[PDB]
Design a protein around this ligand. Structure first.
Ligand SMILES: Nc1nc2ccc(OC(F)(F)F)cc2s1
Lengths: 110, 108
């Protein structure tokens, strides 16, 4: 509470589930994080290699398709986009692996 | 810098950093001419940035995917961020966002 969801920072004391809800399949529900990342948030020891893909505020509003939806639950800013991985980075294969490790990982555990 | 880490300013504007506004899948659609020219130097930039996610929230709130396409591998993201209708500034936020969403459709 108090901090708007989008400005929260997950850590061990206030983790991904607590800040952003349980992972799952539903449309506006987050799907990213294995058990380790869920429990640790930005305390995850490989967090920097994930965060390198997160957009600056400028890039979020510069790159994304932004929209607004007014529904019975309130007014929502929608966003969609895509960020290209740098295939010239020697760490590219590892980046693909790390991201894929967390995408839909929740399917494998309660 | 990697596109996602760029910061648009008067010196390096939204077009220069993030491409022309348009309808295409990997084009941005946000910003009127003033915001495009000024980026984070825009007078109401803070009132826009309040909606941008932290890195933690970006990966926490979003639906993330990975797509292999002819040009390479892309991290996809989508989600929704709720406005606080109890915020005294709510009506002003709606106006500001409406001013910038798809503004490019009206440009000369
Ligand atoms: N559900 C989705 N399918 C796709 C396919 C391609 C795409 O473009 C990209 F740039 F990411 F490659 C984005 C998406 S989101």
């Amino acid at each position: 509470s108090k901090k708007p969801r989008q400005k929260r920072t997950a850590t061990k004391a206030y983790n991904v589930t607590q800040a952003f809800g349980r992972r799952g399949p539903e449309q506006t529900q987050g799907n990213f994080g294995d058990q380790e990342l869920i429990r640790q948030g930005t305390d995850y020891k490989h967090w920097p290699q994930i965060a390198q893909f997160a957009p600056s505020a400028s890039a979020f509003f510069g790159m994304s398709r932004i929209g607004m939806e007014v529904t019975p639950s309130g007014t929502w800013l929608t966003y969609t986009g895509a960020i290209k991985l740098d295939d010239k980075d020697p760490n590219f294969k590892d980046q693909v692996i790390l991201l894929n490790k967390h995408i839909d990982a929740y399917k494998t555990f309660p």
